[PDB]
């Protein structure tokens, strides 16, 4: 019923996560990127991998991993980054160059907050306290607005419902607004619990 804000804003004030051009092997390149992203997500679950950007030029693949824990991905001796690069080169015939971008405030990143709340739900925390503290810390860190929602079999009840908490401004109809949105799923013993988070850090 509500348009995905990322989908609404892509190409207006938000750039694509895949930056390249093709005319003949568009499908091959797209699915190469998809499998690369799936591999990165499966391999860096523990790391706070906010997102990944993929570009390609001169038969090379530039990967930019925006994460909140660059130490885990790089490694103390830079061994983890080299291992990831080698695995990606093995998977894809092309040559891959990987960069890591630090996120200073992981609590203002929609995806990181969504994954954190989903992890707490899997650990069987309180679906109300988790959202309350998440919104509190996001708001105290200077966010102009934040909205959190969790839906499913909340406390294990037979009847599934959804609950949300807001604070500040989340103008989903403003196309100017740079609203970050994320959805995550917790695999609780009762089933899938869907968490959604919207963050609006203000005009930029």
């Amino acid at each position: 019923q509500k348009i995905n804000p990322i989908g609404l804003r892509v190409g207006i004030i938000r750039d694509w996560e895949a930056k390249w051009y093709a005319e003949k092997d568009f499908a091959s390149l797209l699915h190469e990127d998809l499998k690369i992203r799936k591999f990165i997500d499966n391999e860096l679950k523990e790391a706070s991998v906010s997102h990944v950007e993929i570009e390609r030029a001169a038969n090379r693949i530039n990967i930019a991993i925006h994460t909140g824990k660059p130490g885990m991905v790089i490694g103390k001796g830079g061994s983890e980054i080299e291992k990831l690069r080698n695995k990606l080169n093995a998977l894809t015939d092309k040559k891959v160059h990987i960069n890591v971008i630090e996120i200073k405030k992981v609590d203002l990143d929609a995806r990181l907050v969504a994954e954190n709340i989903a992890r707490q739900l899997e650990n069987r925390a309180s679906f109300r306290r988790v959202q309350k503290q998440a919104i509190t810390r996001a708001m105290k860190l200077g966010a102009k607005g934040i909205k959190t929602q969790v839906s499913g079999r909340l406390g294990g009840a037979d009847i599934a419902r959804a609950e949300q908490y807001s604070e500040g401004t989340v103008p989903l109809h403003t196309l100017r607004a740079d609203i970050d949105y994320a959805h995550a799923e917790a695999d609780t013993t009762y089933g899938k619990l869907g968490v959604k988070v919207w963050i609006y850090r203000g005009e930029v």
Binding site: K19, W20, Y21, A22, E23, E55, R56, A57, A58
Partner: protein
């Protein structure tokens, strides 16, 4: 004695900046450039059924627009050719050179 450069990109911003960069490089290398010439943009429209099941009457319309830019180099020089071949454009834009 002309050299054609065809740039194609999904973003008019990136295509314009790349065209300006290559024009500046050619002018620095000395050759004379006529352009940039903006060729018509090619827009491909995709119509998807919004719902996963039934609900034929609700659709969503996406588009892919590729902008096209043309550059003509009139007085080529080895320096101009070397500079053009060594210049690195952003990954978004696709460049084709016809000598």
């Amino acid at each position: 004695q002309k050299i054609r450069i065809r740039l194609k990109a999904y973003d008019h911003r990136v295509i314009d900046q790349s065209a300006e960069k290559i024009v500046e490089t050619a002018k620095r290398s000395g050759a004379d450039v006529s352009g940039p010439i903006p060729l018509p943009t090619e827009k491909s429209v995709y119509t998807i059924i919004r719902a996963v099941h039934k609900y034929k009457d609700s659709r969503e319309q996406f588009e892919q627009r590729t902008h096209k830019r043309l550059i003509d180099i009139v007085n080529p020089t080895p320096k101009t050719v070397d500079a053009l071949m060594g210049l690195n454009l952003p990954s978004g834009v696709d460049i084709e050179i016809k000598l």
